[PDB]
């Protein structure tokens, strides 16, 4: 008997965008399918990772500098939902790559 509300939260991380958007939309749609209340898929600022390297491997010539970057997004979502429904929702339909985290926030 875990019918009581738990104020659960789902964190997401993804080096890409398309699969992250698909996962978030799927979670929202499943929540509506089971008719649960929510705070929307609030977006988080683009955590951009930039590191610069001397493009030459030795060190001579015209000083050339290159920049390598990723861009990750979090998009946390909080659900005022019971226990087993949200567990079943978050343990299904996870396309590869997009890291998902679940916290009871009790």
């Amino acid at each position: 008997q875990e019918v009581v509300i738990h104020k659960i939260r789902i964190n997401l991380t993804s080096t890409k965008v398309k699969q992250l958007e698909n996962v978030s939309a799927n979670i929202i749609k499943n929540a509506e399918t089971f008719k649960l209340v929510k705070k929307g898929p609030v977006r988080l600022p683009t955590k951009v990772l930039k590191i610069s390297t001397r493009k030459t491997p030795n060190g001579e010539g015209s000083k050339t500098w290159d920049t390598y970057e990723m861009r990750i997004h979090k998009r946390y979502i909080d659900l005022e939902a019971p226990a087993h429904i949200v567990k079943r929702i978050t343990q299904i339909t996870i396309e590869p790559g997009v890291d998902v985290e679940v916290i009871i926030a009790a």
């Binding site: 390297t53 491997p57 390598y68 970057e69």
Partner: peptide, 27 residues
């Protein structure tokens, strides 16, 4: 060596394997 974020890779094997790692040319 690139010690940022504990890559622990040098500059140049890193530029070799970065496109595989996930770093990319954007700007």
């Amino acid at each position: 060596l690139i010690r940022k974020y504990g890559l622990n890779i040098d500059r140049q094997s890193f530029r070799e394997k970065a496109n595989d790692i996930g770093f990319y040319k954007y700007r």
